[PDB]
Amino acid sequence: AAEWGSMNQ
Amino acid sequence: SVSERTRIKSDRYESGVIPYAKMGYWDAAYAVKNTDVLALFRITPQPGVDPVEAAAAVAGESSTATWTVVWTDLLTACDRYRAKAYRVDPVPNTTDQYFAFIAYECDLFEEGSLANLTASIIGNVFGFKAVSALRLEDMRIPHSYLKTFQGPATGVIVERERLNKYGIPLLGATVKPKLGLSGKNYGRVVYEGLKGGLDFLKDDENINSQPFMRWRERFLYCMEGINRASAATGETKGSYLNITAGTMEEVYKRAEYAKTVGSIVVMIDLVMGYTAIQSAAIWARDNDLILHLHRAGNSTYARQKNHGINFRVICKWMRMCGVDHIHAGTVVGKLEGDPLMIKGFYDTLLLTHLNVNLPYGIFFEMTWASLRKCMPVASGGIHCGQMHQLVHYLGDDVVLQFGGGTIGHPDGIQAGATANRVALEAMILARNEGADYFNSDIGPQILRNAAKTCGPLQTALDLWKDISFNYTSTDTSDFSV
Amino acid sequence: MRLTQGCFSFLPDLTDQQIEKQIAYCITKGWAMNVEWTDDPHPRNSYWELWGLPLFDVKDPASVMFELREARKSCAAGYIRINAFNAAYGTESCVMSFIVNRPSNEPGFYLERQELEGRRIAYTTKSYSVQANPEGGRY
Amino acid sequence: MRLTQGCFSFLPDLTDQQIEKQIAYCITKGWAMNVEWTDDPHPRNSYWELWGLPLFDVKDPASVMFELREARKSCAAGYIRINAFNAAYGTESCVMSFIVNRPSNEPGFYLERQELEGRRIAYTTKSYSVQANPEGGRY
Amino acid sequence: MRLTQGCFSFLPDLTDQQIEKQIAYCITKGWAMNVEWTDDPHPRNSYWELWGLPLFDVKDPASVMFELREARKSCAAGYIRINAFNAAYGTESCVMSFIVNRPSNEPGFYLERQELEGRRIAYTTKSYSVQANPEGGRY
Ligand SMILES: O=C(O)[C@@](O)(COP(=O)(O)O)[C@H](O)[C@H](O)COP(=O)(O)O
């Protein structure tokens, strides 16, 4: 979801 | 005995077999670095295998692990060299498919070498018995590593300057039939096509040096046809000479000949291999030549959604090696191509930076560190009757190529070339004036209107009016909107 | 012969209304416009003569149309072209170019063939107008 | 002749108490220790024979002293050395090495000179003990 | 040291019954058998001395056993080996080889290191028995 952009700084 | 007394009794370094996820290859609380290389894999576990164990196995066997414990690990900074699985999720609308994210340390790779990068990422993991299927979908290549590669020898910007052509797609065609013609007959077709209004023509991927035609003969006649056409029109023209060969020495011999006779461009095939491709891209930069890449063989591994490598990854690797052009798809032609996936490919080859876009298959944000742009090429069963669709889906930085769509004209090759150029010019003009050229009614009428002042175009429209290739696609998206 | 340099040379000469529309399209993108002239149409003649400086922040095609009108009545017989430049990072180059004035008649070119080693030829493209008269009086 | 390989060869042979102190210094740093043996002392002889595996997590010199005692009464006449390894990123190599046992007599070496082009010589260093007897019976 | 050339050198010396069985296996395939001897065991010493001609159409191991018995009591101290040859198109080479007699003692070899350009070394392997005595009196 939108956690893929925060899990990969 | 000394050996028996010196045996390792540590829980982690005692002899024996333990799961990969307990060897240190799975870390849900891992923090990614800006120098790390990242990979996204679509995995299908064998009945009974735990999804997390499978991800850990892929990470270990692609980095520094084996099937059993080795004490030699204590002679190295082991923790720094191990790759780490850090995220696993089910594929939407699917049971038995999962997405896995993996991070790799920068010091694991050799600077400027594609053979080395691939040796680690795709070396042996695809043959593991514990998985039933596997596919590399995407990768994030960091700025630091990008700076060790050359990037395109010429690049889209410098190339348009070399041709003095700006603000419209380039045009081209392939010589037909594929095999059988002599060098003198080959030059005749080139002369005719260019004279009618094409920017470039090209040899077929399977034309090299055969009993019916030796290469030196073809190169000589082609330069006579190019100069004749350029002097008759006042424009810069050219043809892609094929330098593909069986050994590196023979490749170089054919490249040095084409430069001697004054060719502005040459072409190579993907079947040659990564190391030969890298060598050719370095030569083109040092000798002021444009380099075209044909993707022969790519669909053996890039067609199915369950196993292999997605083309968007090949796009990144080839932009890193430094090719100037690459075939990327047509959407409406006779070869495979989903419109959403194709738009993703074009962006990977032309943008200065990529942002996440799931419906297009973009999984990682990534900058190109000022690497030059690679020009996409559209080819495969397309005709001037489809001009409105080509302009809408492919854009303005692209080479549109018409083989049968030019030579197959009933009034001759020169007539065929004219019909293609006129069709394009009229469509772009209309677009720039703010018309809905993509509408199923406006688009064709625009071409019909132009046809009332050009007989060749009228003939072509009537000939290939009801020609289309509608079939369900194999490689599709997993997200919407 | 008709010189085929430019993006719209396979179409008839464009009217003033047609030209104004294309200009309106380039300014909507934010591009800078300029006008050039020459009497030597060799395909490797990269630098045409400049007509004033480029119009960077002009936001009305009427300003561009006026300048072209002046050149037409001021310059000698020959060719005139309009170009658009994009200074955005990643481009920093020209993005459009088309001819907007031609001579009454153009004879064209011919090829000269010098024979070198083996079967190799060194080609030279030659213009009839250039070889006959100096700049200013070729057309 | 006295072989001068190692860090303390210009000092007299060290006592057991002296050896224990140096070991205590390496373990306070967290280094791994090992013991090796050979009867071929050529300066380019990189791989001596290993006595068991390296002691990785031993935190008491008595364990290292015991192993050295065994080798002394088990191995043939020749040389014994103790090494310390550091596996930290930036090093990953040996950081100390000293001899801890010698033969009753060492004859030494001599040079052989092969004459090649011009005035160039190709040198070879030769050991008296090696050339005379096979491994196990050189000292 | 024990010389490890041959296919069964990691097993104890084979008995006469053991040898006879291996011979019986090679003749069932139709192979030709021969016996050789040497006192120079260098690994690049390709040609051992021949004991008579090869036995081409013998179909009974007893004939091969007899010849080996003779060599044993006739030849000097050293090494003896039995080989099997296959002359079929696609092969035309040896397909088996094993040692069947050894000296009472083998001292082994040592290395000589000549230093050439940069860090390169040219190596030479040397035998203790050969360097000490002429052929016939090495063991
Ligand atoms: O050999 C051929 O079939 C073509 O010359 C097509 O000619 P036509 O114009 O006559 O169809 C091209 O190589 C294909 O387009 C390659 O496919 P792709 O671009 O997908 O790699």
Q: Which DSSP string do the residues of C45-63 spell out, in sequence order? A: ---PEE-SS-BSS---HHH
- B276 burial type by CB count under 10 A (0-12 exposed, 13-18 middle, 19+ buried): middle
Phi, psi of B345 (to 5 degrees): -55, -50
Of all protein residues, the one whose alpha carbon is nearest to atom 14 of ligand 1 is: B380
Ligand 1 pocket at CB < 6 A: B 174, 204-205, 295, 327, 335, 379-381, 402-404
Interface of E with D in 4-33 (CB under 8 A): none
- C47 burial type by CB count under 10 A (0-12 exposed, 13-18 middle, 19+ buried): exposed
Instruction: Report whether B62 contacts B121 (CB < 8 A).
Output: yes
What whole-number distance in Å separates Cα of residue E29 and Cα of residue B374? 64
Number of neighbours of residue B228 by Cβ within 10 angstroms = 18
Instruction: Report whether C39 contacts C63 (CB < 8 A).
Output: no
What whole-number distance in Å separates Cα of residue A6 and Cα of residue B32? 10
Smallest CA-to-CA distance from D80 within D93, D65, D95 is with D65
Residue whose token pair is 């430019």: C6
What whole-number distance in Å separates Cα of residue D14 and Cα of residue D32? 21
Helical segments of B241-365, H only: 248-260, 274-287, 299-302, 311-321, 339-350
Three-state DSSP class for B381?
coil
B294 is catalytic: yes
What whole-number distance in Å separates Cα of residue B58 and Cα of residue B60? 6
Q: Is B174 annotated as a binding residue?
A: yes
Instruction: Report whether B301 contacts B173 (CB < 8 A).
Output: no
What whole-number distance in Å separates Cα of residue B226 and Cα of residue B244? 21
Task: Show me where the domains of chain D are located.
Answer: 1-139
Per DSSP, B91 falls in state P
Supply E9's token pair. 């050198």
Instruction: Report whether C70 contacts B137 (CB < 8 A).
Output: no
Question: Which residues partner with B357 through β-bridges?
Answer: B362
Instruction: Report whether E80 contacts E67 (CB < 8 A).
Output: no
Element housing B400 (H / E): strand B399-401
Decide: C and A in contact? Rule: 3+ Cβ pairs under 8 Å.
Answer: no
What whole-number distance in Å separates Cα of residue B409 and Cα of residue C1? 24
Question: Which residues partner with B367 through β-bridges?
Answer: B353
What whole-number distance in Å separates Cα of residue B85 and Cα of residue B238? 50
Three-state DSSP class for D50?
strand
What whole-number distance in Å separates Cα of residue B103 and Cα of residue B81? 11
Supply B203's token pair. 């040899």
Number of neighbours of residue D72 by Cβ within 10 angstroms = 13
Interface of C with B in 90-119 (CB under 8 A): 90-98, 108-111, 119
Smallest CA-to-CA distance from E105 within B120, D137, C100, B190 is with D137
Distances (CA, A) of B398 to B203, B327, B354, B387: 19, 10, 19, 13
What whole-number distance in Å separates Cα of residue B431 and Cα of residue B436? 7
Instruction: Report whether B351 contacts B405 (CB < 8 A).
Output: no
Smallest CA-to-CA distance from D52 within D31, D30, D37, D73 is with D37
Q: Which of E109, E111, E113, E116 would you mutate first to test chain D, the one with the most D CBs within 10 A?
A: E113
* Cis-peptide, bond into residue B177, ω within 30° of zero: yes
Instruction: Report whether E3 contacts D136 (CB < 8 A).
Output: no
Catalytic residue among B84, B195, B292, B294: B294
Q: Residue D125: its chain E contacts at CB < 8 A?
A: 113
In this structure, the dihedral spanned by the alpha carbons of residues B316, B326, B309 and B301, taken in order and rounded to 10 degrees, is -160
Contacts 24+ apart (CB under 8 A), C84-87: C84/B167, C84/C26, C84/C29, C84/C31, C84/C32, C84/C33, C85/C31, C85/C32, C85/C33, C85/C34, C85/C54, C86/C29, C86/C31, C87/C32
Partner residue opposite A5 with nearest CB, options B31, B86, B356: B356
Crossing angle of the two packed helices B311-321 and B114-121, in degrees rounded to 10: 150
Helical segments of B78-123, H only: 78-81, 114-121
Distances (CA, A) of B179 to B174, B218, B237: 12, 13, 24
- The residue of chain C with its CA nearest to that of B371 is C90
CA C55 to chain centre: 17
- E85 burial type by CB count under 10 A (0-12 exposed, 13-18 middle, 19+ buried): middle
In sequence order, what are the residues at sequence separation of 6 or more whose Cβ sits closer than 8 angstroms to the Cβ of residue C48?
C36, C37, C38, C79, C81
Supply B236's token pair. 């810069």
Smallest CA-to-CA distance from B338 within B317, B375, B312, B377 is with B312
Sign of the Cα torsion B67, B71, B72, B75 reads positive
Smallest CA-to-CA distance from B24 within B83, B74, B69, B73 is with B83
Strands C49-50 and C93-101 turn out to be unpaired
Smallest CA-to-CA distance from B186 within B203, B173, B171, B198 is with B203
Three-state DSSP class for C19?
helix
Three-state DSSP class for B271?
helix
Distances (CA, A) of B52 to B65, B103, B133: 16, 15, 15
Three-state DSSP class for E71?
helix
Q: What is the resolution of this structure in A?
A: 2.0
What whole-number distance in Å separates Cα of residue C46 and Cα of residue C33? 18
Instruction: Report whether E12 contacts E57 (CB < 8 A).
Output: no
Distances (CA, A) of C84 to C25, C27, C34, C36, D121: 11, 9, 7, 11, 73
CB contact under 8 A, D87 and B2: no
Residue type (1 letter), A2: A
Per DSSP, B21 falls in state G
Q: Which residues of B fall below an 8 Å CB-CB distance to A?
A: 31-32, 34, 38, 86-87, 101, 140, 356, 363-365
Whats the size of chain C, residue-wise? 139
Greatest CA separation found in chain A? 15
Q: Is B472 annotated as a binding residue?
A: no
Count CA atoms closer than 13 A to B52's CA, side-chain side.
Answer: 11
Chains touching chain D through at least 3 C-beta pairs below 8 angstroms are B, E
Residue type (1 letter), B284: A
Q: Interior CA angle at B376 toward B372 and B380, to 5°?
A: 165
CB contact, 8 Å: A8 with chain B?
yes
Greatest CA separation found in chain D? 60
Residue whose token pair is 């037409």: C72
Three-state DSSP class for E33?
strand
Whats the size of chain D, residue-wise? 139
What whole-number distance in Å separates Cα of residue D139 and Cα of residue D79? 10
What whole-number distance in Å separates Cα of residue B401 and Cα of residue B407? 12
CA–CA min distance D131, chain E (Å): 8
Question: Exposure pattern of C9-39 as b/e (b: 16+ CB <10 Å)?
Answer: bbbeebeeeebeebbebbbeeebbbbbbbbb
Among the atoms of ligand 1, which is closest to the Cα of residue B295?
21
In sequence order, what are the residues at sequence separation of 6 or more whose Cβ sits closer than 8 angstroms to the Cβ of residue B99?
B40, B41, B42, B43, B87, B88, B89, B90, B91, B137
What whole-number distance in Å separates Cα of residue D116 and Cα of residue E123? 18
B176 is catalytic: yes
Three-state DSSP class for E32?
strand
Smallest CA-to-CA distance from B430 within B420, B441, B443, B415 is with B443
Helical segments of B322-438, H only: 339-350, 387-394, 404-407, 413-432
CA–CA min distance C3, chain B (Å): 6
Helical segments of D1-139, H only: 16-29, 61-74, 128-132
Number of neighbours of residue B243 by Cβ within 10 angstroms = 28
